[PDB]
Design a protein around this nucleic acid. Structure first.
Lengths: 127, 134, 102
RNA sequence: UGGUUCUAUUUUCUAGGACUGAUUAAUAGGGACGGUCGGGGGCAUCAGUAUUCAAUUGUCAGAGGUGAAAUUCUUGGAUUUAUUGAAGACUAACUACUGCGAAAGCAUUUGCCAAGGACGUUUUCAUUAAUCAAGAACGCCGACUAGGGAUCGGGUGGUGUUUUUUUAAUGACCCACUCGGCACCUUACGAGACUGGGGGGAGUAUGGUCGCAAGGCUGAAACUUAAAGGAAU
């Protein structure tokens, strides 16, 4: 499996089982930015990067507000004009959740990406 | 599958009781290698008796780099050499007694494992291409 | 010499191991004897696990010392000396004392 | 390894020159080591008592076998008993919701030959990896949380009893922890989207089609016909 996918799988089903903390290993910059944007929108609480010298561990604390993480496995390019279409086709509803993209300006959600007018490849979603 | 490996400490320093020299360790390393031990045996003897924890920490670099920069390079990597000699030991067992179908099966497994990392070492070109396992 | 069958059927219980040995020994005369031995693995007092099995290397070591010390009790006996030795069951006490270390 | 020449006391010490230059170290993977572990395999060896057969006695009329019998053996002595030999198998109880093996499978001892797994590791390499069409060898679900008791293999710690001593090392049990197994008892939470086939179960009817089936004493029909048999008596 991937390295973002099993971290998001742990952070998904741990919250489904109703835990208040996940430990996810290993940890990359893209995982830090994904948890960064989802705590910017308020889906997880704090999280902490314990640096062992191998790859890093994250302890996320998460309350109740998430209900699905994911990754879109072909990292196809989206456009600023088709951000609205891709959110319509993969989100649950109209203003429900965020598609998260790797852009020129880094990892951002879809509405921040179209706010500062930059497209990029898709990464994953959260709602 | 079991989880039984070694747990490298978080420190990257000499342990502050290691009063020996960073060069006398290298001289002991090349002495043991020239009297003829594989690098894993150098590391375990150095760890057990002259208490360097690990020599990538206490010396500059790892000990196969120390042996290659001091002139004691291996003909073939230690993994491939040990798997080669295990395969030829099973092959001599099979020529001795020819009703050991289980040992024939283990020979197929050992030969597959030979080809895997021989392919890896060949595409890295540690060992030259047109290398065959006889 | 031979046991009755009811004695060793009365000795065999499950949840233990029987270590049995035998040696073909020539005495201080020129009688050659095949002499057997049986032993059953006890459980200690305070043992709470129900098994008390031997780990089969303890079986090989126990059977080794059984063979060695009873082939030491023969060759060091004649037939009359061996018979007077195995009437009061004392080679069994020699085996027990030599094997309680294992 | 070779060669040139510079300083002060017959031999002391000296200076120079020609044959390397990125990270970890995955509760990913491989390899080494260590004490081990197992009814994993191969060869050799050893034993056991049954069974079958044979030899020798002892004694005499039956022995198997069956629901009863029978085929069979038997006064040229069966069956039973005792001593001994030979053969081919097999490894009883111990034997387990235990172990090992990729599966089929594997149970006597001892030795040799290689192998394997788990554990221990402040050893080594550094992505070498996962899945399977083809081919080769042998022959209530998952991507999922926690537990609980028991057991097998390893390790650490405790500090009592069995052990015991100046010959080597080495146990057994109790307890806690921990890793890995064969199972068992529960929990919480998830979309989990050796080839060929008619159409449900239980019945019911049939002016259709294809079959099979009745009569009526036999002999006995062209013959009112014998003997004998049947039936009822």
């Amino acid at each position: 499996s991937s390295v973002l996918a099993d971290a998001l799988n742990a952070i998904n089903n741990a919250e489904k089982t109703g835990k208040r903390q996940v430990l996810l290993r290993p940890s990359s910059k893209v995982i830090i930015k994904f948890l960064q944007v989802m705590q910017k929108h308020g889906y997880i609480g704090e999280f902490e990067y314990i640096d062992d010298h191998r790859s890093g561990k994250i302890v996320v604390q998460l309350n109740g507000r998430l209900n699905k993480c994911g990754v879109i496995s072909p990292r196809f390019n989206v456009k600023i004009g088709d951000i609205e279409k891709w959110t319509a086709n993969l989100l649950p509803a109209r203003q429900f959740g965020y598609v998260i993209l790797t852009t020129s300006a880094g990892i951002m959600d879809h509405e921040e990406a179209r706010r500062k007018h930059v497209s990029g490849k898709i990464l994953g979603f959260v709602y | 599958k079991g989880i039984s490996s070694s747990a490298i400490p978080y420190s990257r320093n000499a342990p502050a009781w290691f009063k020996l020299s960073s060069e006398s360790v290298i001289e002991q390393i090349v002495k043991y290698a020239r009297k003829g031990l594989t690098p894993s045996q150098i590391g375990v003897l150095l760890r057990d008796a002259h208490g360097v924890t690990q020599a990538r920490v206490i010396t500059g670099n790892k000990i196969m780099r120390i042996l290659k920069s001091n002139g004691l390079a291996p003909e073939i990597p230690e993994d491939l050499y040990y798997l080669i000699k295990k395969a030829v030991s099973v092959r001599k067992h099979l020529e001795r007694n020819r009703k050991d179908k289980d040992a024939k099966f283990r020979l197929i497994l050992i030969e597959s494992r030979i080809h895997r990392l021989a392919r890896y070492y060949r595409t890295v070109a540690v060992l030259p291409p047109n290398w065959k396992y006889e | 010499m031979d046991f009755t069958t009811d004695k060793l059927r009365s000795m065999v219980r499950k949840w233990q191991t029987l270590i049995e040995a035998n040696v073909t020994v020539k005495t201080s005369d020129d009688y050659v004897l095949r002499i057997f031995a049986i032993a059953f693995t006890r459980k200690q007092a305070n043992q709470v696990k129900r098994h008390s099995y031997a780990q089969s290397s303890h079986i090989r070591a126990i059977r080794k010392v059984i063979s060695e010390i009873l082939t030491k009790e023969v060759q060091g006996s004649t037939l009359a000396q061996l018979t007077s030795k195995l009437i009061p069951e004392v080679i069994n006490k020699e085996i027990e004392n030599a094997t309680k270390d294992i």
